[PDB]
Design a protein around this ligand. Structure first.
Ligand SMILES: [C][C]([C]([C])[N+](=O)[O-])N1=C2C(=O)[N]C(=O)N=C2N([C][C]([O])[C]([O])[C]([O])[C]OP([O])(=O)OP([O])(=O)O[C][C]2O[C](N3[C]=NC4=C3N=[C]N=C4[N])[C]([O])[C]2[O])C2=[C]C([C])=C([C])[C]=C21
Ligand SMILES: [C][C]([C]([C])[N+](=O)[O-])N1=C2C(=O)[N]C(=O)N=C2N([C][C]([O])[C]([O])[C]([O])[C]OP([O])(=O)OP([O])(=O)O[C][C]2O[C](N3[C]=NC4=C3N=[C]N=C4[N])[C]([O])[C]2[O])C2=[C]C([C])=C([C])[C]=C21
Ligand SMILES: [C][C]([C]([C])[N+](=O)[O-])N1=C2C(=O)[N]C(=O)N=C2N([C][C]([O])[C]([O])[C]([O])[C]OP([O])(=O)OP([O])(=O)O[C][C]2O[C](N3[C]=NC4=C3N=[C]N=C4[N])[C]([O])[C]2[O])C2=[C]C([C])=C([C])[C]=C21
Ligand SMILES: [C][C]([C]([C])[N+](=O)[O-])N1=C2C(=O)[N]C(=O)N=C2N([C][C]([O])[C]([O])[C]([O])[C]OP([O])(=O)OP([O])(=O)O[C][C]2O[C](N3[C]=NC4=C3N=[C]N=C4[N])[C]([O])[C]2[O])C2=[C]C([C])=C([C])[C]=C21
Lengths: 430, 430, 430, 430
């Protein structure tokens, strides 16, 4: 085994560092002057445009599909660098990547070519979004005997009609709330939403994914697609994840990601599994920023003492703990993404590895930021340092992209409970 | 041994609750429309004025001195209730109480009856502040051979001349930056601030506390007392702890709190030890609000499932951990405050108990808020819930009023290292 | 609010200390030469006798019933001192107290008078045991639809026939496997053992507690009561809790503790709820012994350095954390035992407090011992120090007397799930 | 970046598993009957003999030196499989590897060829030991101005005379207390052991390593080399780490490992850094055995419930936490040993990675065994399950091979304090 980065991986890092260093660094000056979530988001459009220009959006699509993605390892390296500087715009990129994953994973060349085109063109500010989350929650969306998703779809002729509400999906409403360039709406098939989901059926067999573009939205009545609100977040204040309501929203049958059922649910699961693995790079990035800033401070400040505070064991212990969390996190992420790319491995093995990664990396990231603040002391509580922003943003990772308590841990539990569970299949094989 | 509350204490809670729900609840609507810390602080004045009218300020001065204080247990019960609703103004009350303690503890009836007059009248909005913290830090202010406090004082004629800068002292500048009604400036005696502190002289033996009032500031040149800035805090955004600079600031000798040296340092230590214990009440209040909001949510929301999330063991485990943290914390606080009033115990014993409380309560309060958020899930990240504000505010406790890593733990370590260390003196007597 | 110990409580500690230092300290030299669990337990008999003579068994019975129990706080204080020195015999005293509680709590004066007699006489060495635990576990014994207790009682004429196996009940077989002087066998009423429990009837309504004595066993066939094995434990190597098999074991109807059903289940719950609060005293005692031995070592050993290791911040941090855990634990236990004795509080509130105590104290105790060993270093791993023993014994508390994960946390979760759940009822009343 | 294993690495795992299953599993039945440490240690000799015959000893010496070690990753895999079954003998192999390390790392083919010969012959049961640890401790053996090592050496004619005592060195005395086939005694140069170390000279410059064989001991007076005792350990009851007291022990000048000073200290530091990295493999092996035993139990036992306990979220949470700690640990170890073999990275980087590994893996392994026990419940406390043994064995890891609190963390803190500290050098290059 080896951990020596290839020339292209080293370049991806270099390129990624130069980007946010010369681009993202100027982001705050713009959105910091906005009064609301949406305004802040829109203020980042120019920076997203640059991301596109630098080919960071095209890098989210596989080469075989006209993109420039090299591997999940390159992507993890790039994300770490971006989040280590500015999550703004960087989060918009990962959001788009998620929105594209279902199409990238489906087995319909014509569908991919048609919907991925604006993302591989390298121009404009194409936004993608995987609309799954709902106001009532989704941790139990696959619970047999449960209500199931409240966003339902029914086939009426050569088209589908969507009804329901979504909440949290990133960039779902695009820059101007008239829809994202591409949205994968996850729905539960139901000819009559008024009637509860059959408690005897497997919820996964009721899943359908409908591709919704700005064109789709413009072909519908205005009251068929509307944004009820834009949540004000504690951190990631420039991100958009509106509360959207679909009322008799018509979608062409040609926009069906795939045959409703297990195949559709499998695509959503695969997309979220790959995302869970990459979320680690985001947590590491944010946590690393705190660590390096505390490290720099501890090695150059005595706090009125006779020596740099890093000389005090208690301070060093905190920093040591931070370093270890980051190091173990990155290794787990790399192992996860590489495991996901190993065709010879069973999906259950890949899913477990991805779940572990998301759970661990997001939990310790919070601890790392807090410990860094304790080591720095009172000064870390003022806005003149990065810590205030970092705490609010790191607290999002353990909650988003499938909270650890309600979703990820449960998905992992399920796999571990299987009779043929192979604990170390991803390491020593079978 | 018993824990039953007396009618006096039960009344304190009710009054604290009534005040917090009638006055404090309306604070947000006022300071939320302000742009900066200072403006947000000034916006809380009408609320501080109401606190004074409710005798909350006079309740910070012991009856013998003209106040109406009943006990530290009453004060803790009050603080828990106030902070469980709105830290704004509440933090101002505790700040004034701290700046008052030095005078309350000194054995000079003359200074007391003179400088405690405006705080017991029950009129206006008198602010007191203990100016100790400095821009370079204070965790090593007593280290032998170190730089020592940067705020020095020298005797010139029949008055003292202060030179140096202070940073973080609450309400130190007052409502209009013209100085707090009463300020206890902690300085290091030095005839020449140009030369470093004598490395062969014990720092504590050179500590002096000068009382500075608005009048004192008015009797000096405008450039002798200047506010250099107001730090933007991540939490407790309505507090004021400016960066003050003293330049040949002349103070009457009659304003010396006590003899310079160990007696002055003792007053400061004692004041900070008492506040350190009461901080636990503030931490509990903040952490309780998070626990309760999460508890209510878990017993009323199913998150799209078939049952309330509290029925999920993982969720219950989180709520249970928060409950235990809050429970153990309140008991510790109560034990600490009582121990501090037990004149049958040596100071080292009281000190150690006070440090234990501050270290434990503030540390677990952070974990309690975070665990609660993880239980609630994604929705806890939206500002429509209290969690966003609670997280920011709670992260201040482990850092302020003497950080745990640099100050409190060191103070406790010192006592434990002593030859006559009595581990359980506060419990099973000495 | 008062933590001042009365003269009787202070006297209880002194008495326990004297007993521990004069008697318990000599136990090790006796059982250490035995090659098995039973033999080691028997070797402690000549030590239990002393406990009886000192009135330790009599102190397990309330005064109104002929005992000398002063209060649970006295018991808490006594157990801490006893376990801080030697778990041997001390655990046997706790075991007897548990086996006596059902009778102590029942509403049958005649029954109490009859069966408690040999325990309040202060003669010989009477052993009591609450036989509840079984080979298949008991965490789900009250689970509706589950198999329930595998030890069942069948009413045959004027006698009860017991069938099934018990495992873990402390000293249930007495000193010679001829049975404890008094055993409270918790059974599930079943007219036909070969048939599974009825999934339509609440398990709690089928619980019966049968009193079994050495006489009852003598009145039965030899193989109607047999010890199948004596588990070799990791710690508390002198305790007895055999695997017992009841085959057509006849028990006089008069030996029925009370009316089968909710009332019987109620007695078992209250008994285990009271012990759950007291185990905290046992955990504190074992952890205190580790902390004190690490503290003494740290204050007198430099480990080849130039100063006592307690001067190193990392060592101090460990000691500080152990002290806090011990401090918060004792306060919780006292609050719990005090709450349990408050006749003005609903059972729900008392049970909740008892669960919090058992969960917190036993969990934190394990960390306290481990941290003490890390602070001491390599030396703590040799049997020339007492850590090796403290580690194995402390690890028992989280698992025994109702495991935290399967039983205690679940009982607490249930209480919190209730619609009328009052979080702070035990502190601020209703 | 790649984690895939080569055919040789998989073969190494299969070979280790076969050896542990066909040989190590029979060790317990042999040493369990012995009464003391030495006797137990001696009972493992036949098993160590088999290890030799299986070439496991020769596999501790690099291929360029005539050994058969393929790489540190192969070694890490072998150790994990061995310790997952039986630490006995396995720990002996590890001890020998550390003892040979100083010679393996020195730049003298002549010395290497001469002293490594018995260990690569593939016959007998040769033991090696790195004698560094002492009765007074060694955490501050390099502290400037401190006592320093108490085992001193002085040059007399064409040979050296050793004076002092060693405590803990594994197999230092050999199978019959006549000495290990090879021992690297770490001494502090001093012409007069009665005089204190010069507080003006860097301790590292006075370090000397002398090679002592059974022949060396046999060529000295019986009173010059004597075992003063064999500590009884809580775990790893078959390991030997005598208390030796060199008295005017004469060693040939040619047996000097290298020139006294930083070079000698460098060899010790390097040897211990590599051991620290491999210790993680041992911790993983032990923790893995606990995890797997609890996993199997949780999937096949309902504990009197209606479903396997793994179906309970609190139980799954414990197993998930264990799995994650194991996964992150193996990855950190593989990364560490790989970093150690990277000739492109400077020492400080390799050292930092090695310390992080020892610190994380050993600490986390303890938590894993405990969580596994809490998951299984009461049954884990009985010796009919392996948990009791695993708990005692895992607790040694955080303390031995350089405790984390006194040595490892201090070594890491030293590196991080360096002005040229490159946090991510091992990952993203310099
Ligand atoms: C993530 C994403 C991004 C872009 N990235 O990728 O990075 N985003 C998104 C998108 O895109 N899309 C979608 O759809 N979405 C999203 N988001 C949202 C989120 O993710 C969500 O919401 C989450 O994650 C989920 O939620 P949660 O929280 O996890 O769940 P719920 O349902 O809500 O629940 C809550 C709670 O409760 C409990 N539970 C429940 N259930 C259960 C439980 N437990 C146990 N068991 C069971 N069964 C728990 O506690 C939970 O937690 C997003 C967001 C944001 C902010 C951003 C920025 C982005 C995004
Ligand atoms: C608190 C108060 C209030 C009002 N109350 O009472 O509630 N305030 C105040 C006042 O009033 N006054 C004064 O003076 N001040 C104040 N503040 C401020 C604070 O408190 C301070 O600043 C703190 O606490 C302190 O600081 P810290 O951080 O703790 O310390 P420093 O110096 O800074 O340091 C840092 C760090 O470093 C380290 N270290 C050092 N040294 C050492 C160490 N370690 C170890 N060892 C040693 N020796 C550590 O890490 C530390 O941490 C305030 C504030 C606020 C915010 C408010 C609101 C209020 C107030
Ligand atoms: C405790 C006692 C003493 C004397 N004191 O009090 O001190 N002892 C006894 C007596 O006396 N009696 C009786 O009866 N018993 C006894 N023991 C025994 C014990 O306690 C028992 O066994 C326990 O505690 C119970 O068990 P656990 O473990 O807790 O449960 P189980 O069933 O077995 O289970 C296990 C596990 O699994 C799981 N889970 C289940 N289920 C569930 C779960 N989770 C969740 N959820 C659900 N549902 C968990 O993980 C659990 O853990 C005793 C003992 C000993 C050792 C001694 C020394 C004494 C005694
Ligand atoms: C390890 C080894 C084996 C074989 N392997 O490799 O696996 N072994 C050995 C050998 O071989 N050799 C030698 O030499 N040794 C040995 N060992 C022993 C051990 O390792 C040692 O001893 C340890 O680790 C070290 O110790 P510690 O504990 O770490 O240190 P001290 O000095 O003792 O100390 C203690 C304590 O204190 C404190 N501190 C001190 N100092 C300081 C501190 N803190 C802070 N700072 C400073 N400066 C702390 O707390 C510490 O901890 C061994 C063993 C065993 C058991 C085995 C089985 C084997 C072996």
């Amino acid at each position: 085994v080896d951990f020596k980065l290839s020339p292209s991986q080293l370049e991806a890092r270099r390129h990624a560092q130069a980007f946010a260093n010369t681009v993202l660094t100027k982001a705050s000056a713009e959105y910091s002057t906005q009064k609301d979530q949406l305004s802040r988001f829109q203020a980042t459009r120019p920076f997203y445009r640059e991301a596109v220009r630098h080919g960071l959006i095209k890098a989210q699509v596989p080469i075989p599909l006209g993109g420039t993605m090299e591997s999940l390892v390159h992507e993890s390296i790039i994300l770490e660098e971006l989040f280590a500087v500015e999550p703004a715009t960087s989060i918009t990129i990962v959001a788009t990547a998620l929105g594209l994953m279902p199409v990238i994973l489906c087995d319909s060349p014509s569908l991919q070519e048609k919907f991925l085109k604006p993302f591989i063109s390298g121009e404009g500010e194409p936004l993608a979004s995987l609309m799954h989350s709902e106001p009532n929650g989704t941790a139990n969306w696959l619970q047999k005997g449960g209500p199931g998703l409240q966003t339902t779809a029914r086939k009426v002729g050569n088209e589908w009609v969507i009804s329901g509400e979504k909440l949290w999906p990133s960039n779902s409403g695009g820059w101007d709330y008239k829809g994202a360039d591409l949205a994968c709406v996850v729905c539960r098939v139901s000819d009559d939403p008024s009637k509860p989901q059959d408690p005897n059926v497997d919820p996964a067999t009721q899943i359908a994914v409908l591709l919704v573009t700005r064109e789709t939205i413009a072909n519908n009545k205005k009251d068929a697609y509307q944004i009820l609100g834009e949540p004000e977040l504690a951190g990631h204040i420039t991100t958009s994840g509106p509360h959207t309501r679909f009322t008799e929203f018509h979608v062409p049958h040609e926009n069906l990601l795939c045959t409703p059922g297990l195949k559709a649910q499998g695509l959503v699961e695969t997309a979220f599994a790959m995302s869970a693995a990459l979320v680690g790079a985001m947590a590491i990035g944010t946590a690393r920023a705190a660590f390096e800033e505390a490290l720099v401070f501890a090695k150059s400040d005595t706090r009125g003492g006779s020596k740099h505070i890093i000389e005090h064991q208690s301070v060093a212990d905190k920093l040591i703990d931070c370093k270890i969390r980051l190091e173990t996190s990155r290794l787990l992420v790399w192992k996860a993404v590489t495991t996901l790319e190993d065709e010879a491995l069973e999906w259950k093995v890949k899913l477990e590895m991805a779940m572990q990664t998301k759970i661990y990396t997001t939990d310790v990231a919070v601890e790392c930021v807090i410990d860094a603040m304790k080591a720095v002391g009172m000064k870390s509580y003022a806005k003149d340092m990065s810590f205030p922003r970092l705490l609010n943003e790191v607290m999002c990772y353990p909650l988003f992209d499938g909270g650890n308590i309600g979703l990820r841990r449960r998905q992992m539990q399920r796999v571990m409970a299987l009779e043929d569970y192979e604990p170390w299949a991803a390491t020593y094989g079978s």
